[PDB]
Structures are given as C-alpha cells and as structure tokens.
Amino acid sequence: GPGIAVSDDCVQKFNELKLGKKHRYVIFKLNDDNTEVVVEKVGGPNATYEDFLAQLPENDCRYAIFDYEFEVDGGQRNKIVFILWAPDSAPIKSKMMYASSKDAIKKKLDGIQVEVQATDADEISEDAVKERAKK
Ligand code: NI
Ligand code: NI
C-alpha cells in the first residue's frame, strides 16, 4: 500500500529538538484515520525522562524522539533516541499499524542515533534506554 503521510510538523518539531535543544522530547501518533503521522505532545527544553514517561498511554502505541543526555563524564554527551512504544495491552490493529509506519517516520527524521522498541515498563525505563544509548 501507499506509504503513510508524515506531517511537516513532525520534521519541524524534530529539528527544534535536534538543532535548537528547544524540546526535550516529541511524541508522535497516527491520526484517527491512520493516514498521517502527527505530533501529539512536546516537552519543554528541561523536561525530565519521568515527565516523558507520564505522557505515554498504557494501551496504545506511540513514536517518540528523546534527546537523551548522559551523566557528565569528561563533558556531556547526548544521543537522539527514537522510540517505538508498543505496549502489549495495545490492540493488535494498533500494534500492526505502528509497525507498518515506523520506517516512514524514521526516514523523515535526519539524525536518529539510537532506536528502542519498548513493550513494558522495564524496556521503556530510563536504565534500559540509557544502556541501549550508551551502546
Ligand atoms: Ni505498500
Ligand atoms: Ni517548539
């Protein structure tokens, strides 16, 4: 089938994060008709990882970009982390729709450095993402 559309807002907000460090994170979702990827929520420049986690639905999928900052250790390194949040409680149709569209949204974001697929509270936890991003 045709590739899903990706709103220009997705790229616009991603570049604000990647370039301006204006937003700590961006959460994207498939619109109601599953015809376009759109921005749902953005975090402030200083939002925390726990702030981000509190935005994730327990029973639906999301895409997200998190500008992950590691602990200071000879300077402060960061990693642009792309996350597919696919909780097991999500309906199978949702899980399959977000799987099908993942490439499309990734292809539109210039500068992803790390990719995480998380399905439960442990795989989305900061410790798990940190280790995957350190890596
Ligand atoms: Ni196709
Ligand atoms: Ni903004």
Side-chain angles (χ1 to χ4, degrees):
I4 196 136
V6 174
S7 165
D8 297 345
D9 301 330
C10 295
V11 184
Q12 168 197 50
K13 283 284 126 162
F14 170 76
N15 287 336
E16 285 188 21
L17 174 151
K18 176 62 181 223
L19 293 174
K21 282 202 92 86
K22 288 183 64 283
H23 295 289
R24 184 49 67 196
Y25 70 79
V26 183
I27 294 168
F28 315 76
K29 66 178 304 265
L30 301 182
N31 69 353
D32 272 333
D33 290 304
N34 308 96
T35 55
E36 183 177 29
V37 185
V38 301
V39 173
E40 186 190 39
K41 306 158 161 0
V42 299
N46 300 314
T48 69
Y49 195 83
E50 296 196 349
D51 299 332
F52 158 69
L53 288 178
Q55 306 305 309
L56 294 172
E58 91 275 3
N59 62 349
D60 192 14
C61 301
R62 295 293 187 260
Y63 312 116
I65 295 293
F66 197 99
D67 181 359
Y68 191 81
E69 283 169 354
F70 299 98
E71 258 164 15
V72 190
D73 186 30
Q76 189 159 56
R77 277 156 271 299
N78 79 300
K79 286 273 173 82
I80 309 281
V81 185
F82 174 87
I83 298 163
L84 167 57
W85 169 243
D88 273 37
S89 303
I92 185 66
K93 179 182 208 24
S94 168
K95 280 182 276 204
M96 285 178 95
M97 207 68 195
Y98 277 77
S100 289
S101 290
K102 187 229 272 154
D103 183 52
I105 178 65
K106 289 210 293 135
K107 188 193 181 213
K108 282 272 191 157
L109 306 185
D110 276 340
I112 295 168
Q113 287 167 314
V114 176
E115 179 164 16
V116 190
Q117 183 144 132
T119 67
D120 72 14
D122 285 324
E123 304 180 332
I124 191 65
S125 80
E126 187 173 354
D127 255 319
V129 172
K130 175 169 57 205
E131 274 337 302
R132 180 88 252 280
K134 258 209 118 166
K135 240 192 295 209

Short mmCIF file of all heavy atoms in Angstrom, two decimals, residues 27-58:
data_model
loop_
_atom_site.label_atom_id
_atom_site.label_comp_id
_atom_site.label_asym_id
_atom_site.label_seq_id
_atom_site.Cartn_x
_atom_site.Cartn_y
_atom_site.Cartn_z
N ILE A 27 6.46 13.47 21.05
CA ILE A 27 5.69 12.24 20.91
C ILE A 27 4.83 12.38 19.66
O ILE A 27 4.15 13.40 19.49
CB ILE A 27 4.81 11.96 22.14
CG1 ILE A 27 5.69 11.65 23.36
CG2 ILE A 27 3.91 10.77 21.89
CD1 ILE A 27 4.97 11.65 24.66
N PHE A 28 4.88 11.37 18.78
CA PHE A 28 4.10 11.34 17.55
C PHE A 28 3.07 10.23 17.64
O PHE A 28 3.29 9.21 18.31
CB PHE A 28 4.98 11.11 16.32
CG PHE A 28 6.23 11.94 16.28
CD1 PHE A 28 7.32 11.62 17.06
CD2 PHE A 28 6.32 13.04 15.47
CE1 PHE A 28 8.48 12.38 17.01
CE2 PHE A 28 7.48 13.80 15.40
CZ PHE A 28 8.55 13.48 16.15
N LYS A 29 1.96 10.39 16.93
CA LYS A 29 0.95 9.37 16.86
C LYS A 29 0.38 9.28 15.45
O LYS A 29 0.48 10.21 14.65
CB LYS A 29 -0.20 9.62 17.87
CG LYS A 29 -1.01 10.88 17.56
CD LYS A 29 -2.18 11.10 18.55
CE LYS A 29 -3.13 9.94 18.64
NZ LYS A 29 -4.31 10.14 17.73
N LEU A 30 -0.25 8.14 15.16
CA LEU A 30 -1.03 8.00 13.94
C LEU A 30 -2.38 8.68 14.15
O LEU A 30 -3.01 8.54 15.21
CB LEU A 30 -1.20 6.54 13.57
CG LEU A 30 0.10 5.76 13.36
CD1 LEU A 30 -0.21 4.30 12.95
CD2 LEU A 30 0.98 6.40 12.33
N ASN A 31 -2.81 9.46 13.16
CA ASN A 31 -4.08 10.16 13.29
C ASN A 31 -5.23 9.15 13.31
O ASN A 31 -5.03 7.93 13.17
CB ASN A 31 -4.24 11.19 12.17
CG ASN A 31 -4.44 10.55 10.82
OD1 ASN A 31 -4.35 9.32 10.67
ND2 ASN A 31 -4.71 11.38 9.81
N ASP A 32 -6.45 9.66 13.48
CA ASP A 32 -7.60 8.79 13.70
C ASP A 32 -7.82 7.84 12.53
O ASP A 32 -8.19 6.68 12.73
CB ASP A 32 -8.85 9.63 13.94
CG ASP A 32 -9.04 10.00 15.40
OD1 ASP A 32 -8.57 9.24 16.28
OD2 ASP A 32 -9.67 11.04 15.68
N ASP A 33 -7.60 8.32 11.31
CA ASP A 33 -7.82 7.52 10.11
C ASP A 33 -6.59 6.72 9.69
O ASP A 33 -6.63 6.05 8.66
CB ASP A 33 -8.27 8.42 8.96
CG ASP A 33 -9.68 8.96 9.17
OD1 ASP A 33 -10.61 8.14 9.35
OD2 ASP A 33 -9.85 10.20 9.16
N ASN A 34 -5.51 6.77 10.47
CA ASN A 34 -4.28 6.05 10.14
C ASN A 34 -3.80 6.38 8.73
O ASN A 34 -3.36 5.52 7.97
CB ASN A 34 -4.45 4.56 10.34
CG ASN A 34 -5.01 4.21 11.72
OD1 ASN A 34 -6.22 4.03 11.89
ND2 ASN A 34 -4.12 4.14 12.71
N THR A 35 -3.88 7.65 8.38
CA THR A 35 -3.41 8.15 7.10
C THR A 35 -2.26 9.13 7.22
O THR A 35 -1.68 9.48 6.20
CB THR A 35 -4.56 8.83 6.33
OG1 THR A 35 -5.13 9.87 7.14
CG2 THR A 35 -5.63 7.81 5.97
N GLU A 36 -1.92 9.58 8.43
CA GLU A 36 -0.82 10.52 8.58
C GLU A 36 -0.25 10.42 9.98
O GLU A 36 -0.97 10.17 10.95
CB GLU A 36 -1.30 11.97 8.31
CG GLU A 36 -0.22 13.02 8.37
CD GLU A 36 -0.72 14.40 8.04
OE1 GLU A 36 -1.91 14.70 8.29
OE2 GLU A 36 0.08 15.21 7.54
N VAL A 37 1.07 10.61 10.08
CA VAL A 37 1.75 10.73 11.36
C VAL A 37 1.74 12.20 11.77
O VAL A 37 2.09 13.08 10.97
CB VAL A 37 3.18 10.20 11.29
CG1 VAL A 37 3.82 10.23 12.68
CG2 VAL A 37 3.20 8.79 10.73
N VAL A 38 1.37 12.46 13.03
CA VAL A 38 1.22 13.82 13.54
C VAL A 38 1.89 13.95 14.90
O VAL A 38 2.12 12.98 15.61
CB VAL A 38 -0.26 14.23 13.65
CG1 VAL A 38 -0.94 14.14 12.29
CG2 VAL A 38 -0.98 13.35 14.64
N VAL A 39 2.16 15.20 15.28
CA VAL A 39 2.69 15.48 16.61
C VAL A 39 1.55 15.47 17.62
O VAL A 39 0.52 16.14 17.43
CB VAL A 39 3.44 16.82 16.62
CG1 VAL A 39 3.85 17.19 18.08
CG2 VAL A 39 4.68 16.75 15.73
N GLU A 40 1.72 14.73 18.71
CA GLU A 40 0.74 14.75 19.79
C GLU A 40 1.16 15.65 20.94
O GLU A 40 0.36 16.44 21.44
CB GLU A 40 0.50 13.33 20.31
CG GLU A 40 -0.62 13.27 21.35
CD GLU A 40 -0.72 11.91 22.06
OE1 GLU A 40 0.33 11.29 22.37
OE2 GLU A 40 -1.86 11.47 22.32
N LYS A 41 2.39 15.52 21.40
CA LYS A 41 2.86 16.21 22.59
C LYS A 41 4.33 16.54 22.43
O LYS A 41 5.08 15.80 21.80
CB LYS A 41 2.67 15.39 23.87
CG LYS A 41 1.25 14.89 24.10
CD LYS A 41 1.23 13.69 25.03
CE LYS A 41 -0.16 13.46 25.64
NZ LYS A 41 -1.19 14.45 25.20
N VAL A 42 4.74 17.67 22.99
CA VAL A 42 6.14 18.04 23.05
C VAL A 42 6.47 18.43 24.49
O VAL A 42 5.62 18.90 25.24
CB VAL A 42 6.51 19.18 22.08
CG1 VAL A 42 6.25 18.76 20.63
CG2 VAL A 42 5.77 20.46 22.43
N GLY A 43 7.73 18.22 24.86
CA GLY A 43 8.19 18.55 26.19
C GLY A 43 9.00 19.84 26.15
O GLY A 43 9.55 20.21 25.13
N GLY A 44 9.07 20.51 27.29
CA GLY A 44 9.88 21.70 27.44
C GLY A 44 11.36 21.36 27.32
O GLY A 44 11.77 20.19 27.44
N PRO A 45 12.19 22.38 27.10
CA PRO A 45 13.63 22.10 26.95
C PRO A 45 14.23 21.36 28.12
O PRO A 45 15.24 20.66 27.96
CB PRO A 45 14.25 23.50 26.78
CG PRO A 45 13.18 24.46 27.29
CD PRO A 45 11.88 23.81 26.94
N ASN A 46 13.65 21.49 29.31
CA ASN A 46 14.20 20.93 30.53
C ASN A 46 13.33 19.82 31.12
O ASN A 46 13.51 19.46 32.29
CB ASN A 46 14.37 22.05 31.57
CG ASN A 46 15.32 23.14 31.09
OD1 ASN A 46 16.40 22.86 30.57
ND2 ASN A 46 14.91 24.39 31.25
N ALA A 47 12.39 19.27 30.36
CA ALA A 47 11.58 18.18 30.87
C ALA A 47 12.47 17.01 31.25
O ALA A 47 13.58 16.84 30.74
CB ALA A 47 10.54 17.75 29.83
N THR A 48 11.98 16.19 32.16
CA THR A 48 12.71 15.03 32.63
C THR A 48 12.24 13.77 31.90
O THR A 48 11.21 13.75 31.25
CB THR A 48 12.52 14.84 34.14
OG1 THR A 48 11.16 14.47 34.39
CG2 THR A 48 12.83 16.15 34.89
N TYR A 49 13.02 12.70 32.04
CA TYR A 49 12.59 11.43 31.45
C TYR A 49 11.31 10.94 32.11
O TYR A 49 10.46 10.35 31.44
CB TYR A 49 13.70 10.39 31.54
CG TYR A 49 13.46 9.20 30.64
CD1 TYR A 49 13.81 9.24 29.30
CD2 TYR A 49 12.84 8.05 31.11
CE1 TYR A 49 13.56 8.17 28.46
CE2 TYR A 49 12.60 6.98 30.31
CZ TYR A 49 12.96 7.02 28.98
OH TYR A 49 12.70 5.95 28.17
N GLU A 50 11.12 11.19 33.42
CA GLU A 50 9.87 10.78 34.05
C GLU A 50 8.68 11.59 33.54
O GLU A 50 7.58 11.03 33.42
CB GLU A 50 9.97 10.90 35.57
CG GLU A 50 11.00 9.98 36.19
CD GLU A 50 10.80 9.83 37.69
OE1 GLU A 50 9.99 10.60 38.26
OE2 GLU A 50 11.46 8.96 38.29
N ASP A 51 8.88 12.87 33.22
CA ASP A 51 7.85 13.66 32.56
C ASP A 51 7.43 13.02 31.24
O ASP A 51 6.25 12.97 30.93
CB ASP A 51 8.34 15.09 32.28
CG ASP A 51 8.71 15.86 33.55
OD1 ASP A 51 8.14 15.56 34.62
OD2 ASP A 51 9.56 16.77 33.45
N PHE A 52 8.41 12.60 30.44
CA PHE A 52 8.12 11.92 29.17
C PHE A 52 7.32 10.65 29.40
O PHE A 52 6.29 10.41 28.73
CB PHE A 52 9.45 11.61 28.47
CG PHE A 52 9.38 10.50 27.46
CD1 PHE A 52 8.68 10.67 26.29
CD2 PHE A 52 10.04 9.30 27.68
CE1 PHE A 52 8.62 9.64 25.34
CE2 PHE A 52 9.99 8.28 26.75
CZ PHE A 52 9.27 8.45 25.58
N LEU A 53 7.76 9.81 30.34
CA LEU A 53 7.08 8.54 30.60
C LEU A 53 5.62 8.76 30.97
O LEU A 53 4.75 7.97 30.60
CB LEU A 53 7.79 7.77 31.71
CG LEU A 53 9.14 7.15 31.40
CD1 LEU A 53 9.74 6.45 32.61
CD2 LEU A 53 9.02 6.18 30.23
N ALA A 54 5.33 9.85 31.70
CA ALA A 54 3.96 10.09 32.14
C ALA A 54 3.04 10.42 30.99
O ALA A 54 1.82 10.35 31.17
CB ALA A 54 3.95 11.23 33.17
N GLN A 55 3.59 10.75 29.82
CA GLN A 55 2.78 11.06 28.65
C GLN A 55 2.40 9.83 27.83
O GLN A 55 1.59 9.95 26.91
CB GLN A 55 3.52 12.03 27.73
CG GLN A 55 3.99 13.32 28.38
CD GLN A 55 2.87 14.06 29.06
OE1 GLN A 55 1.82 14.31 28.46
NE2 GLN A 55 3.09 14.44 30.31
N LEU A 56 2.94 8.66 28.13
CA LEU A 56 2.74 7.50 27.26
C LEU A 56 1.46 6.78 27.64
O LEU A 56 1.24 6.52 28.83
CB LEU A 56 3.91 6.55 27.34
CG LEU A 56 5.25 7.11 26.78
CD1 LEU A 56 6.37 6.14 27.09
CD2 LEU A 56 5.12 7.35 25.30
N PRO A 57 0.61 6.44 26.69
CA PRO A 57 -0.62 5.69 27.03
C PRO A 57 -0.31 4.24 27.33
O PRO A 57 0.56 3.62 26.74
CB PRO A 57 -1.48 5.84 25.77
CG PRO A 57 -0.45 5.91 24.65
CD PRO A 57 0.77 6.62 25.23
N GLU A 58 -1.04 3.68 28.30
CA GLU A 58 -0.79 2.31 28.69
C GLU A 58 -1.31 1.30 27.67
O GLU A 58 -0.84 0.17 27.65
CB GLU A 58 -1.38 2.03 30.08
CG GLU A 58 -2.81 1.50 30.11
CD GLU A 58 -3.85 2.61 30.05
OE1 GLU A 58 -3.46 3.79 29.93
OE2 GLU A 58 -5.06 2.29 30.13
#
